[PDB]
Amino acid sequence: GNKLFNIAQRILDTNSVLLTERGDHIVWINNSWKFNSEEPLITKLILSIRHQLPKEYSSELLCPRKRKTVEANIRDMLVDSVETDTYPDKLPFKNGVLDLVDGMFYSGDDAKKYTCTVSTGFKFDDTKFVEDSPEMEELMNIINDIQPLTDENKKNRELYEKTLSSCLCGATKGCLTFFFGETATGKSTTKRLLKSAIGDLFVETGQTILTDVLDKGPNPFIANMHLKRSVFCSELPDFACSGSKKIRSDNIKKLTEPCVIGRPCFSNKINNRNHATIIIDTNYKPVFDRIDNALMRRIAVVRFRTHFSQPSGREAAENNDAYDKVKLLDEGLDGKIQNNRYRFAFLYLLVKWYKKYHIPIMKLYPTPEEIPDFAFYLKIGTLLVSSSVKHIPLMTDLSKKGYILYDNVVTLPLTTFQQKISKYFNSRLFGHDIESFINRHKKFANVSDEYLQYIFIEDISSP
Amino acid sequence: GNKLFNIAQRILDTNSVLLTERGDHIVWINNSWKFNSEEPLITKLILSIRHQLPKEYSSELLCPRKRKTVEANIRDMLVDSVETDTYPDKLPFKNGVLDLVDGMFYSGDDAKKYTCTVSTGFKFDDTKFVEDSPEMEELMNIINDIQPLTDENKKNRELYEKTLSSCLCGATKGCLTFFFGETATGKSTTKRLLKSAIGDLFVETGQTILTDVLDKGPNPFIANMHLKRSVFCSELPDFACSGSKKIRSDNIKKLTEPCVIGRPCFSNKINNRNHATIIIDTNYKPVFDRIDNALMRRIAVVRFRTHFSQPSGREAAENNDAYDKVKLLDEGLDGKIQNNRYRFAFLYLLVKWYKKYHIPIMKLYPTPEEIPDFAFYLKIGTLLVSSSVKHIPLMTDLSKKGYILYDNVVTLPLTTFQQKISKYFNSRLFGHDIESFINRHKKFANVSDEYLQYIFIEDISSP
DNA sequence: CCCCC
Numbered sequence: 001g002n003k004l005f006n007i008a009q010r011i012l013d014t015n016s017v018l019l020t021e022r023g024d025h026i027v028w029i030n031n032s033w034k035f036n037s038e039e040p041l042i043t044k045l046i047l048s049i050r051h052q053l054p055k056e057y058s059s060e061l062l063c064p065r066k067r068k069t070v071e072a073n074i075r076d077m078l079v080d081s082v083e084t085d086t087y088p089d090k091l092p093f094k095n096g097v098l099d100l101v102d103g104m105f106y107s108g109d110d111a112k113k114y115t116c117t118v119s120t121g122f123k124f125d126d127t128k129f130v131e132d133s134p135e136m137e138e139l140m141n142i143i144n145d146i147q148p149l150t151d152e153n154k155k156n157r158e159l160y161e162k163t164l165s166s167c168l169c170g171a172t173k174g175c176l177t178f179f180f181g182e183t184a185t186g187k188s189t190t191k192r193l194l195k196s197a198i199g200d201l202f203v204e205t206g207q208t209i210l211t212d213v214l215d216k217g218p219n220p221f222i223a224n225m226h227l228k229r230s231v232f233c234s235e236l237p238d239f240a241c242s243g244s245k246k247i248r249s250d251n252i253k254k255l256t257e258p259c260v261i262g263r264p265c266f267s268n269k270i271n272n273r274n275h276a277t278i279i280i281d282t283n284y285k286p287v288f289d290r291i292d293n294a295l296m297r298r299i300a301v302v303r304f305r306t307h308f309s310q311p312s313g314r315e316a317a318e319n320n321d322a323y324d325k326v327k328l329l330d331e332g333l334d335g336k337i338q339n340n341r342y343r344f345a346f347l348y349l350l351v352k353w354y355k356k357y358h359i360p361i362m363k364l365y366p367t368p369e370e371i372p373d374f375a376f377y378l379k380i381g382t383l384l385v386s387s388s389v390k391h392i393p394l395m396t397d398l399s400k401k402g403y404i405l406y407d408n409v410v411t412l413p414l415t416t417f418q419q420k421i422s423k424y425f426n427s428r429l430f431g432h433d434i435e436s437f438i439n440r441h442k443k444f445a446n447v448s449d450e451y452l453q454y455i456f457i458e459d460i461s462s463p
Numbered sequence: 464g465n466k467l468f469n470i471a472q473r474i475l476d477t478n479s480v481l482l483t484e485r486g487d488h489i490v491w492i493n494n495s496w497k498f499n500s501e502e503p504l505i506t507k508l509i510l511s512i513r514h515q516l517p518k519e520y521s522s523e524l525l526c527p528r529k530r531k532t533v534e535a536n537i538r539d540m541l542v543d544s545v546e547t548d549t550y551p552d553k554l555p556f557k558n559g560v561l562d563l564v565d566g567m568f569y570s571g572d573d574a575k576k577y578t579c580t581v582s583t584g585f586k587f588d589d590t591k592f593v594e595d596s597p598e599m600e601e602l603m604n605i606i607n608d609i610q611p612l613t614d615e616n617k618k619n620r621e622l623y624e625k626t627l628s629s630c631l632c633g634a635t636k637g638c639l640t641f642f643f644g645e646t647a648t649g650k651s652t653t654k655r656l657l658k659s660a661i662g663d664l665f666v667e668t669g670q671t672i673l674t675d676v677l678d679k680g681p682n683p684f685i686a687n688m689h690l691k692r693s694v695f696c697s698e699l700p701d702f703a704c705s706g707s708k709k710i711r712s713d714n715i716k717k718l719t720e721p722c723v724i725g726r727p728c729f730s731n732k733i734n735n736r737n738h739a740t741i742i743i744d745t746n747y748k749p750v751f752d753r754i755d756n757a758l759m760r761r762i763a764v765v766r767f768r769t770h771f772s773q774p775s776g777r778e779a780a781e782n783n784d785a786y787d788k789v790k791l792l793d794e795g796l797d798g799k800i801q802n803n804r805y806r807f808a809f810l811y812l813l814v815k816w817y818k819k820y821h822i823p824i825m826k827l828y829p830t831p832e833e834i835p836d837f838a839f840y841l842k843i844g845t846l847l848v849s850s851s852v853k854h855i856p857l858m859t860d861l862s863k864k865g866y867i868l869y870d871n872v873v874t875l876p877l878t879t880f881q882q883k884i885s886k887y888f889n890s891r892l893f894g895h896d897i898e899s900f901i902n903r904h905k906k907f908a909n910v911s912d913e914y915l916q917y918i919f920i921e922d923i924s925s926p
Numbered sequence: 927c928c929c930c931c
């Protein structure tokens with residue numbers, strides 16, 4: 001009995017509705033997996049696949065009440081969760097899945113085995129996914145204008161290519177990249193090109209994810225990054241002028257983890273999967289509230305140094321020290337990019353870069369030598385080291401150099417340490433930094449009298 | 464009559480739905496005591512159980528309306544409230560429960576009597592639960608490298624072993640474990656190994672729980688210790704910097720209490736049971752403003768004295784004092800531990816350590832000596848003893864020494880006390896301790912008079 | 927329920 005129960009069982013036997021570990025209901029319609037808590041996806045699937053059931057079952061599914069009964073039966077039948085979005089080298093489209101390691105495009109049940117629950121939102125066109133075209137030469141000219149193929153720009157260009165290509169691989173990336181440069185240098189053009197290329201896998205959020213508390217309450221600004229392969233933030237302010245909050249290192253470290261806590265309004269799903277490449281456009285370098293060794297492992301910088309100016313302001317730009325090259329501005333390029341002219345050309349370029357930079361494992365490495373905020377830590381980290389045991393047979397040398405021994409621990413006088421620091425970094429130049437380092441790296445032998453359990457590398461080098 | 468009432472009664476006879484003190488229901492589907500406030504779990508269980516009922520009842524449960532009526536009956540029958548997680552010698556694994564006292568593993572229905580809602584998160588395998596393993600040998604070698612098996616490095620090893628074994632205890636512990644050391648001392652890799660070994664029973668929280676109010680408003684960090692056998696803290700804010708908040712001895716005592724304060728968001732069930740031992744990882748000595756016998760009974764310290772470094776910097780690493788023994792670092796160890804390679808060997812190691820520590824009671828013990836902050840408290844407790852009239856039979860000796868009889872009590876002037884202490888503990892080297900003593904125990908009987916209501920142990924011993 | 931506070 002229960003024709004409706006039989007219909008629900010038949011639909012469940014097709015493996016077209018699945019329950020995820022988070023609590024979602026993903027359905028397979030029109031050659032793609034979709035989930036949406038606001039749309040009647042299960043009844044949509046029932047109506048869509050009414051054609052694959054017997055003729056006596058097809059006519060029963062034209063009634064919304066009966067479709068809702070079938071949906072209730074299916075919901076009670078789904079008891080086990082599944083693992084979704086586990087292939088980091090598959091790019092999902094609206095009509096199939098592209099193999100990023102092989103170049104094969106799968107449609108239908110071939111693409112169904114990879115439970116890719118997101119998509120670009122548009123259809124793959126193999127007649128445009130071609131190497132040579134009128135659009136490809138123009139796109140290559142644009143890219144070579146933005147990032148010149150010169151010898152002094154080799155490393156920066158390769159880093160730019162790697163960062164752009166990493167927006168295809170759906171895994172957790174462990175760095176935050178900063179597109180730094182002066183005005184009119186191509187950063188927004190690059191952003192728009194990437195958005196056109198990867199479609200719905202691209203999202204843009206606010207600086208609140210960098211300068212606010214992520215726990216909070218309902219946070220759609222974080223909940224909108226679930227499974228996105230690229231996240232953009234833009235327009236960092238100048239932190240030198242007091243009045244702007246600094247970037248939270250806690251947020252920076254929390255954004256590189258495989259899961260991020262944040263939930264929408266009227267929703268109970270708090271944890272989102274992190275597959276994102278986070279890129280920040282800025283005219284100014286970042287300043288963080290607190291600097292430590294971990295934070296320095298998650299920051300990378302790509303610099304833009306080509307100006308596109310109108311003919312009136314070309315001469316003033318040619319004498320600027322923030323530009324290496326000046327080019328003529330193009331006034332139709334924005335519209336051409338907006339109309340998705342270079343979508344498949346840039347997609348092909350990104351796939352080629354993915355192949356080139358995906359030597360067995362692809363990983364993003366930090367560039368801490370570019371951020372001025374990290375210079376004080378980087379310099380002093382190679383000059384002073386903790387107490388020494390194998391250098392214990394040098395206590396006479398330490399005493400002659402000014403150090404003292406206390407429980408076989410090297411201690412330096414505060415005044416002597418200040419005088420030594422003044423040589424490498426002037427007091428007038430970095431008094432706040434030197435005083436903070438003295439107060440932070442030193443232990444308190446008393447309320448007033450204290451000592452630093454850190455000796456200079458050069459002092460120990462002296463025999 | 465009321466066939467649906469009969470069905471509900473028969474389902475209730477199987478003890479598959481229970482009502483917990485938190486207000487929610489727990490159901491037994493697919494061999495797991497699972498609960499949800501968002502899923503139709505009771506109707507799912509009804510549809511699954513329908514096979515066990517008679518034939519005339521089985522065809523009744525194919526209608527969602529009938530299942531809803533049966534659910535209404537079943538949840539109107541549930542009047543008595545029960546409790547979960549009542550057994551401390553059991554480990555819940557994804558497909559059963561392992562017994563600590565008996566060394567037996569029960570699968571399927573045999574795990575039903577144990578109302579365990581949380582689990583480690585990996586299937587229990589008997590074949591890999593063996594001693595003849597190539598993995599346990601390398602694991603023991605790595606553990607020996609991190610903690611040398613020597614007389615000088617024995618107390619630290621014992622404390623480390625007890626802290627690791629505490630995660631298998633299903634009870635409340637009053638001690639908080641601390642990891643102290645230098646860079647690459649094994650703390651992070653030990654944390655990774657423990658996370659791999661215990662699966663979902665490990666949570667990581669920032670520094671908010673330590674440097675903020677534990678209750679405050681919403682405290683997800685505090686609430687995450689709810690049935691979390693291990694709590695981790697990383698990148699602690701060293702106290703040498705001036706202008707940072709402090710960890711509270713009141714918070715330490717609250718964590719030592721058998722139910723720590725903590726609630727989830729939009730919730731009132733703050734009475735969350737505590738089976739947690741907190742592991743705090745840092746690199747600098749903590750500073751506590753108020754230090755006393757109560758705080759000294761709830762503070763544990765474990766110090767690392769090893770370092771692995773590159774061969775180019777191997778001699779420089781061996782030079783340092785923070786490394787008792789210096790070895791050569793292996794870069795693949797990170798991936799090896801992140802891949803959960805030695806999970807069964809580590810689990811058997813912890814089980815064997817628990818068997819060695821199988822005393823009816825297994826309680827953690829503070830190690831206040833290691834922390835440099837508690838040295839002053841040890842000196843004060845061993846030297847500063849309250850003195851007053853109850854030992855009146857020393858008046859002649861006090862007059863001979865130079866003291867006075869204030870109602871036949873033992874007291875010394877503040878200036879005299881400072882002059883006497885100047886020989887033992889330097890005033891410049893004990894300024895904070897002297898100020899605290901003067902503010903606390905320097906009791907006087909007059910506004911202008913200066914006296915202290917205590918005498919040194921030497922003054923007590925010598926008449 | 928969010929927002930508001």
Ligand SMILES: Nc1ncnc2c1ncn2[C@@H]1O[C@H](COP(=O)(O)OP(=O)(O)OP(=O)(O)O)[C@@H](O)[C@H]1O
Nearest residue numbers: 142145183184185186187188189308329330333334
């Ligand atoms: N290769 C190119 N050749 C000619 N014109 C270009 C080229 N790339 C970009 N342009 C144009 O020159 C200007 C460059 O400004 P664009 O918005 O790209 O960068 P930006 O000012 O650095 O960005 P942001 O919005 O982050 O400040 C735009 O008007 C753009 O259309």
